[PDB]
Amino acid sequence: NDEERIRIKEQGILQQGELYKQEGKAKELADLIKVTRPFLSSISKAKAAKLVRSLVDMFLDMDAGTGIEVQLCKDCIEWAKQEKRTFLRQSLEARLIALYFDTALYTEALALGAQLLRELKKLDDKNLLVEVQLLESKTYHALSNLPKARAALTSARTTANAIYCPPKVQGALDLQSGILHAADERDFKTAFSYFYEAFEGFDSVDSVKALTSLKYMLLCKIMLGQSDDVNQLVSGKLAITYSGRDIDAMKSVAEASHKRSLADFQAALKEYKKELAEDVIVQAHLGTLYDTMLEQNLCRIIEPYSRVQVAHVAESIQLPMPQVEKKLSQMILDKKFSGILDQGEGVLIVFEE
Numbered sequence: 001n002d003e004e005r006i007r008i009k010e011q012g013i014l015q016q017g018e019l020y021k022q023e024g025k026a027k028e029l030a031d032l033i034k035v036t037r038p039f040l041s042s043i044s045k046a047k048a049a050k051l052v053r054s055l056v057d058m059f060l061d062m063d064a065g066t067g068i069e070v071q072l073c074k075d076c077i078e079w080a081k082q083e084k085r086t087f088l089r090q091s092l093e094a095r096l097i098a099l100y101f102d103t104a105l106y107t108e109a110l111a112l113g114a115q116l117l118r119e120l121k122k123l124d125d126k127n128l129l130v131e132v133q134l135l136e137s138k139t140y141h142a143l144s145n146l147p148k149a150r151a152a153l154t155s156a157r158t159t160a161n162a163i164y165c166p167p168k169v170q171g172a173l174d175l176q177s178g179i180l181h182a183a184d185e186r187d188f189k190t191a192f193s194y195f196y197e198a199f200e201g202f203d204s205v206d207s208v209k210a211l212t213s214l215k216y217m218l219l220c221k222i223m224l225g226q227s228d229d230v231n232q233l234v235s236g237k238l239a240i241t242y243s244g245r246d247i248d249a250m251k252s253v254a255e256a257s258h259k260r261s262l263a264d265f266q267a268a269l270k271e272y273k274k275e276l277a278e279d280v281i282v283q284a285h286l287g288t289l290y291d292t293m294l295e296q297n298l299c300r301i302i303e304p305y306s307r308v309q310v311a312h313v314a315e316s317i318q319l320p321m322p323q324v325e326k327k328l329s330q331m332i333l334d335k336k337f338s339g340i341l342d343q344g345e346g347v348l349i350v351f352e353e
Contacts, residue, residue: 006042010051013039017055026064030072033059037079049088052076056095066103073099090119094128097135101142109139126159130169133159137176141183150180167201171209174198178216179281185223185288192220203238211242218250219282222257223289230254249275253289260296262317265289295331298324302339302350310346321346 013036020029033055040048056076060069073096080089093116100109113136120129133156140149153176160173178194181187199213214233221229231254233239234247249272256264269276269286276282294317301316302308314324328348331337338351 009039010043010047013051014054017058021058021062024062026059026062026068029055029059029062030068033072033076045085045087049085049091052080052088053091053095056092060095060099066105069099070096070103070105090116091128094132094135097132101135101139104142106139106143109135110143113139126163127165127169130156130160130163130165130173134172134176137180141176141180146180146183149183153177153180167205168209171198171201171206171213174201175209175213175216178213178220182216182220182223182281183284185285188220188223192217192224195220207242211244211246214239214242215246215250215279216281218247218254219285222250222254223285225257225292227254227257245272246275248272256293257296260293260300262293262297265293294327295336298327298331299337302337302348306350306352308348308350310341310348313348 013032017029017032020026020032033052036051036055040051043051056073059072064072073092077089077092077096080086080092093112097109097112097116100106100112113132116132117129117136120126120132123129133152137149137152137156140146140152153173157173157177160169165173174194174197178191178198181191181194195213195216199210199217202210202213204210217233218230221227221233230251234251239247249268252268252272253265253276256262256268277286297317298313301313310325310328311321313328314321317324325341325343325346328337328339329341332339332341338353340349340351341347342349
């Protein structure tokens with residue numbers, strides 16, 4: 001009757017905490033976290049850790065205000081130190097690092113990350129270490145430090161090479177690798193591969209990250225000038241399933257590429273604002289995607305001519321003439337176009353390629 005009534009209390013605490021979460025009662029849930037503390041000592045350190053972790057997670061999905069969220073985390077941490085519950089403290093610190101990242105609180109995510117890593121590296125069971133090295137990578141990347149983002153991910157992968165990681169950890173690792181090979185726009189081909197691995201590992205387990213990975217497969221293909229592969233990849237028995245605005249956006253960008261049309265590229269970006277410019281990773285690449293679309297559309301217009309007025313080219317792409325003349329001279333200077341400009345009579349001569 002006593003091992004049982006302790007079990008029923010566990011259920012009850014979680015049920016009520018879950019209810020406070022759904023009804024949006026943050027303060028009530030904060031109090032429940034404090035009030036349950038003595039009860040936690042009549043159960044194993046591990047049962048208690050599950051329980052505390054579960055409530056704190058509930059608290060952090062409530063939009064309570066970064067300030068109140070970070071303070072609640074520090075309090076449970078400080079409590080965990082004051083109780084010598086080590087594994088629990090460490091994993092509450094890991095959660096808080098995740099919170100700092102999510103909240104754009106980057107330098108404190110690093111500061112806390114550095115502390116925790118010193119401990120975690122001097123211990124067995126490396127699963128948590130992977131998590132923290134991956135967060136370190138994610139946060140260096142957000143701070144625009146690719147060397148240190150790559151180096152943190154390398155550590156994560158090497159640590160994960162030892163363990164047999166669950167698919168969501170593997171997926172997330174394959175997703176960062178993809179993000180980082182693509183970040184400097186130097187290796188979209190291997191980035192594509194990592195995204196494909198990520199997609200395969202996430203599929204039927206986490207369908208939001210599966211969708212993200214597929215999306216980035218398509219992005220890579222586009223960036224590679226291989227945008228005609230996009231229809232085949234989408235058509236595939238498994239991809240079909242993932243229909244929606246995200247895939248429609250990439251398909252629409254792929255079409256713009258195919259038609260070498262800046263106007264269609266612009267119509268995509270603003271029809272699919274949420275799926276394109278608001279995707280931190282697509283956004284990172286739209287600048288150079290724009291250049292390529294501009295260039296390809298200009299090639300399309302020039303193609304029928306051995307000699308063409310710049311005014312004609314500018315009217316066709318519906319852009320002011322100085323911009324178009326500037327683009328053309330740059331394309332010629334960087335050997336992207338085999339031709340020459342008569343700047344005074346406004347003519348571009350095109351060489352027999």
